[PDB]
């Protein structure tokens, strides 16, 4: 309309779409670099996960207190520059070793095939730290200042951000796959480096624009281990604490669709009912869970939006539970009807808690409580990897669901204790 296309609400969807696309192409590239190395997805993939999770679990509160105490534009631009420079610097190494593979040049401990993995993981970890800083600042700060005082416009911005994430999580791997199989997987990596280089400048510009277009953003209000407990007791002294923990418990889940494609995904061929539809259906219930949020939130409010988005997830995971017992092939039918029909309650619950954290957390503590929620989210994602490794046998799976459904039911009791304490012990 040329009137909506220049709003600061749209130059934010755009600057977010570009960042998410860059991050996701680069994740699929690094996921195909882990095939020029140990072909297994258990040891080395889970160790990549452990490294990124540990890094953010440690530095979440320091990153948060850096987001607060400094500025709004310098923070966004520093984090943007850092992530895109680290992405091109990892893509260059990825290429310069994706060509010269299996050439041990020196015999000492700095040899190639392992210093390459160490360097890729360190630079990927810096990329992830920077992108977490950008997530904190942009979403939890600029969506709340841009959305003004409007509890139904902020709901729409949250659901919109999530829908962009959900469609990019599909379309970015397919684009980079057609590039990496069209010509070759070396020009692919060089291309993702170039893409990230140009979109760095584009997003630099878009952020500067959104800053000029809403003047409410220019208005601001053992030190490392000091500000690690000055952020983990604050996050505990908050009245909203019990919801941000009930959310963190939904991350220690093996039934998360991305991980079930690793183990217990055999006997089904690609493009028939797996990555063409079963990867494309979980992107439908991810849009169909963000449209239930904005709807339920009007009819029944933001605390009973989390209470129906909880007995929805729990009730569809009673399908993944009757599966492993099969009481009166079938079993793989249900387990995937559960993992997919329970993303309606998981993406609707993720959005209430995101919006409770947004309007109930003071502006001064807005980055600290939002770093310590990230750290809480990985601390439970870490204990997710610690459980897939040392328990990787096919026989030992019938239990990685029951102790992955129990952290769901235990994260929806820490919300039912939040609800019953906020709006009517006997009123619901």
């Amino acid at each position: 309309l040329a009137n909506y296309l220049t709003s600061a609400k749209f130059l934010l969807y755009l600057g977010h779409s570009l960042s998410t696309w860059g991050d996701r192409m680069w994740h699929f590239a690094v996921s195909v670099f882990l095939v020029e190395l140990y072909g297994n997805s258990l040891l080395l993939t889970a160790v990549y996960g452990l490294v990124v999770a540990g890094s953010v679990l440690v530095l979440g509160a320091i990153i948060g207190d850096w987001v607060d105490k400094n500025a709004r534009l310098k923070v966004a631009q520093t984090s943007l520059v850092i992530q895109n420079v680290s992405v091109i610097l990892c893509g260059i190494i990825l290429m310069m070793v994706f060509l010269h593979k299996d050439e041990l040049l020196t015999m000492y401990h700095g040899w190639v095939l392992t210093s390459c993995y160490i360097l890729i993981i360190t630079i990927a970890n810096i990329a992830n730290l920077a992108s977490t800083a950008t997530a904190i600042t942009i979403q939890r700060d600029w969506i709340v200042v841009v959305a003004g005082e409007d509890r139904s416009k902020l709901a729409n911005m949250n659901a919109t951000v999530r829908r962009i994430d959900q469609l990019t999580n599909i379309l970015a791997p397919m684009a980079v796959g057609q590039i990496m199989t069209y010509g070759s997987p070396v020009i692919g990596c060089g291309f993702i480096s170039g893409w990230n280089l140009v979109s760095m400048c584009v997003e630099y510009f878009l952020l500067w624009k959104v800053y000029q277009k809403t003047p409410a953003l220019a208005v601001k209000a053992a030190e490392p281990f000091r500000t690690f407990r000055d952020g983990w007791v604050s996050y505990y002294n908050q009245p909203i604490f019990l919801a941000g923990m009930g959310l963190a418990f939904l991350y220690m889940t093996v039934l998360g669709f991305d991980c079930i494609t690793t183990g217990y995904a055999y006997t089904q061929g690609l493009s028939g009912s797996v990555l063409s539809i079963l990867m494309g259906a979980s992107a439908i219930t991810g849009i169909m869970g963000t449209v239930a949020f904005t709807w339920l939130r009007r009819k029944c409010g933001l605390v009973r939006t989390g209470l129906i988005s909880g007995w929805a997830q729990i009730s569809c995971l009673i399908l993944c539970v009757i599966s492993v017992f099969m009481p009166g092939i079938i079993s793989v039918s249900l387990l995937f009807a559960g993992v997919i029909a329970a993303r309606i309650g998981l993406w609707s619950f993720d959005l209430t808690v995101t919006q409770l954290l947004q309007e109930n957390v003071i502006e001064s503590e807005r980055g600290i409580i939002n770093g310590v929620q990230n750290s809480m989210n990985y601390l439970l994602d870490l204990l997710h990897f610690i459980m897939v490794i040392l328990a990787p046998n096919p026989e030992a799976f019938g239990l990685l669901v029951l102790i992955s459904v129990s952290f769901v039911v235990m994260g929806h009791i820490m919300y039912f204790r939040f609800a019953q304490k906020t709006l009517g012990n006997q009123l619901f």
């Epitope: 505990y236 409010g301 933001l302």
Partner: antibody, heavy 120, light 108 residues
Framework: EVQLQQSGAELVRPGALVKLSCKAS????????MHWVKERPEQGLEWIGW????????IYDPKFQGKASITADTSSNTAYLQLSSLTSEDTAVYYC?????????????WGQGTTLTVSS | DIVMTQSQKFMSTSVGDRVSITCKAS??????VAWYQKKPGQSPKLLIY???NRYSGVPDRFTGSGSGTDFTLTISNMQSEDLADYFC?????????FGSGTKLEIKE
């Protein structure tokens, strides 16, 4: 300039009804939660309840759940409290207050107070 | 329910004196305590939220401190525009409860 102006100075025979009004100016009643608070003569503040004007959800203090009804009209930008079956104990100054989240750190803006006298 | 308690109903002070008003919860609120001041025949105005933050535009001699269960408002170098009532609200959980108040008074 944000204000909340209240109807004032009602005198009510006991056992009747009364409705006390709180008209907002300079913000949208709909972006907030509206709280009612009671201050008895020489007594502490007491909380009656809130109403979410968007969907009309009301939460009350269990000692007011019988005889307090908080309603709101966004079109008029105004909130209301209805006290029913009045008694001598009901005489107090009623305040209308404005809070942002379910856990907003404060009541930044307050109503001028409405003295209610229940006597015969 | 959390029952906020203010032992002193009265505090006898003098101008230029540091007066410390104390408030005590009945459960662990955390830092969920704000401080209001009301003068006779008026509406309560904010001073200090989340037990330490100083609301934007109140003089810099009002300080707030405490955590967990025992909290304190602190007036340094009291002036003559401070003789009022002070009470602590807790927003840790619903129903909200207010402190029963503490009235300052110049001391003769």
């Amino acid at each position: 300039e944000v204000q909340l102006q209240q109807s004032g100075a009602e005198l009510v025979r006991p056992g009747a009804l009364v409705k006390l009004s709180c008209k907002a100016s300079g913000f949208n009643i709909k972006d907030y939660y509206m709280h009612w608070v009671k201050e008895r003569p020489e007594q502490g503040l007491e909380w009656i309840g809130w109403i979410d004007p968007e969907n009309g959800n009301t939460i009350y203090d269990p000692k007011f759940q019988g005889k307090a009804s908080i309603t709101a009209d966004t079109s008029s930008n105004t909130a209301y409290l209805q006290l029913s079956s009045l008694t001598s104990e009901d005489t107090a100054v009623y305040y209308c207050a404005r809070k942002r989240g379910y856990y907003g750190p404060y009541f930044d803006y307050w109503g001028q107070g409405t003295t209610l006298t229940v006597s015969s | 329910d959390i029952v906020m308690t203010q032992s002193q109903k009265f505090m006898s002070t003098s101008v230029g004196d540091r007066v410390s008003i104390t408030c005590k919860a009945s459960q662990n609120v955390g830092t969920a305590v704000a401080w209001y001041q009301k003068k006779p025949g008026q509406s309560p105005k904010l001073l200090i939220y989340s037990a330490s933050n100083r609301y934007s535009g109140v003089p810099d001699r009002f300080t707030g401190s405490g955590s967990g269960t025992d909290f304190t408002l602190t007036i340094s170098n009291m002036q003559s525009e401070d003789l009022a009532d002070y009470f602590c609200q807790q927003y840790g959980s619903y129903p909200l409860t207010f402190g029963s108040g503490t009235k300052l008074e110049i001391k003769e």
